[PDB]
A paper describes a structure:
[name] catalysis, which plays a vital role in cellular energy homeostasis by catalysing the reversible magnesium-dependent formation of ADP from AMP and ATP10, is dependent on distinct ATP- and AMP-binding subdomains (ATPlid and AMPbd). The turnover rate of [name] is limited by product release, and it has been shown that the microscopic step accountable for this slow release is the re-opening of the substrate-binding subdomains. [name] populates two main structural ground states: an open substrate-free state and a closed Ap5a-bound state. The ground state structures of the [name] and Y171W variants in their apo- and Ap5a-bound states were determined by X-ray crystallography.
The Pro177 to Ala ([name]) mutation was chosen because proline at position 177 is conserved in AdK11 and introduces a kink in helix 9 whose importance in the enzyme's opening/closing dynamics has been demonstrated by all-atom molecular dynamics (MD) simulations. The apo and holo structures of both variant enzymes are very similar to that of the wild type with only minor differences in the conformations of their AMPbd and ATPlid domains. Analysis of the Cα displacements in the X-ray structures of the apo- and Ap5a-bound states compared with wild-type [name] of the two [name] variants revealed that the displacements of the apo states were significantly more variable than those of the Ap5a-bound states. That is to say, the apo states are more conformationally heterogeneous. NMR chemical shift perturbation analysis also indicated that the conformations of the apo states differed more than those of the Ap5a-bound states, showing that the apo states exhibit greater structural heterogeneity both in solution and in the crystals. While no similarly pronounced change in the rate constant was observed for the [name] variant, this mutation is significant because subsequent analyses showed that both, this amino-acid replacement and the Y171W variant, redistribute the native energy landscape of [name] (see the section kcat versus kM and kcat versus KD compensation). To assess the accuracy of these measurements, we also determined the diffusion coefficients of the [name] mutant, which were almost identical to those of the wild type.
Residue numbers in the entry: 1 to 214
The structure:
Amino acid sequence: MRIILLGAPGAGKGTQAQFIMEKYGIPQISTGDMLRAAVKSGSELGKQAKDIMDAGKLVTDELVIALVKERIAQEDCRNGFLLDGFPRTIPQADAMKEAGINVDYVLEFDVPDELIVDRIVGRRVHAPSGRVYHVKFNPPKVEGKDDVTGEELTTRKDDQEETVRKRLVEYHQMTAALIGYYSKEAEAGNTKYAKVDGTKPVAEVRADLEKILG
């Protein structure tokens, strides 16, 4: 069972990761994780990808692909894998096909931008301790203040409404053609594609995956 899980930043597609992992007994894999696990290994690619990172240049599509083919070749991927957040472009996806890395399902965790914004800007945090809150779901006992210390709560620079919005616009701009690519690939029978609605409750989204997957 080989699955590609896609979704906008802050949509929360990771909320179904462990379900898929336990359902079909497969590891979760991201380009970020293997970038490190490669350097950790004495692999040539690891040493290669290490130099590119130390020099602060983007990792080439060919090198990332090589790391992927290397990653899924390991024994933990005997029954498949869960590929999280990759590919991100059509060249990358085609490069996976050019190297014969097919997948069974392409899942698109979909959440409207406005909802994502609403979720994120609602966050509050106690920076020095790292304690997190949220105006809904988990508000502090004393309004605007940390339960433990009683100090005023703040917000992350990474959660600024203006910052989050640019991230989404950028993401859609970069992912739009790729979604159509896999949807068309599905019409060609090369893989299966399904646009999952991530606005419903977790338990409901989970049950929808079982009808899509099996």
